[PDB]
Q: What sequence folds into this?
């Protein structure tokens, strides 16, 4: 571990990361909500972004092994598309999930990494940290894991799901306001 | 301005201070007894010390909106597995806001003497089932490693006094919650047994 070489092979890593982002943008694989932030981060000389994603809502079932996704959305969802996803449930535990946007950022030095973590935390991404895999991870706290059923049996009704959907979308909107806040302050990291 | 290596220079002092805080918390019975053995073991290792931590919790609480932990009121708070009756008694106290049944992973905060020591601990914790472990902060006073697991639950039970669930759904919720808590406890014990590796 070298303080001035926080991310190993930074030049090459950034080159590869930019190439991967170009493809993602081309195919639309990139979550439009985080595009602005990704471009701003990569514009700063001492950073680059890798496998990242915007907030997302999902319906999935898992044994207790390898889960199966029944529905996946990267924006505010509607009641009926979630209902349709739930009707696909057949086995295991059925969960309705809300995930915060997550960004992985390479950094030239430890100082660069720490400054980014501190800035991200100040903008609402309280779970931002330095991850060992070293890389910076930016993540918020509005996560949700709602148990909806088990082994083909749904425990909740439509009105209940409508309430869960309303709350999930409120988190999605909160995520967006946070990305915008961070995006507007990230230029402060430029030297 | 982060001062490189200052936390290492300040380690001896930071550990002494952390130990004084733990010593009193223990005497006053403020530490989740569940992980007292683990905390003592971590502090027994030369290059680490512990700061405020917890062993996992199941909660029945009401808050204005899902996102606002600042505004919450706990009707029921447990750091152990629970019975349906305990949960029902907490639910009976619901009167305002959204009522939620929550399950949260244990969270340990550990100071490390060097960046290398921090990484070694993070990797060990991850290997023990705490996938959300990482380096939370680096200041001139200390470097904090956070140890946390991924399991959790967030189930809406009612709103503004109205309850949305029945006993069979509640039974299923409590069943899963207890399964998660049991996993948390198992992982904490696994970590305690592997700490010596460091």
A:
């Amino acid at each position: 571990l070298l303080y001035m070489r926080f991310t190993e092979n930074f030049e090459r890593a950034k080159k590869e990361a930019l190439m991967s982002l170009e493809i993602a943008l081309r195919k639309g694989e990139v979550d439009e909500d985080i595009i602005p932030l990704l471009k701003k981060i990569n514009s700063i000389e001492n950073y680059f972004t890798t496998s990242s994603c915007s907030g997302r809502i999902s319906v999935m079932e898992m044994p207790h092994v390898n889960a199966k996704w029944l529905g996946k959305w990267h924006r505010e969802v509607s009641l009926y598309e979630v209902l349709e996803a739930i009707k696909k449930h057949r086995s295991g535990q059925l969960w309705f999930l809300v995930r915060s946007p997550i960004l992985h950022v390479g950094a030239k030095t430890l100082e660069d990494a720490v400054k980014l973590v501190n800035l991200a935390v100040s903008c609402g991404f309280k779970y931002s940290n330095i991850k060992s895999i070293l890389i910076v991870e930016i993540r918020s706290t509005e996560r949700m894991d709602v148990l909806l059923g088990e082994n083909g049996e749904i425990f909740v009704g439509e009105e209940y799901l409508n309430k869960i959907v309303e709350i999930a979308n409120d988190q999605m909107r909160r995520f967006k306001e946070k990305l915008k806040r961070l995006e507007s302050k990230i230029n402060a990291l430029n030297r």
In short: The CA atoms of residues 103 and 134 of chain B lie 21 Å apart. The beta strands of chain B are 48-54, 57-63, 73-78, 98-104, 107-112, 134-138, 143-148, 153-159, 162-163. Chain B touches chain A through 30 residues (CB under 8 Å).
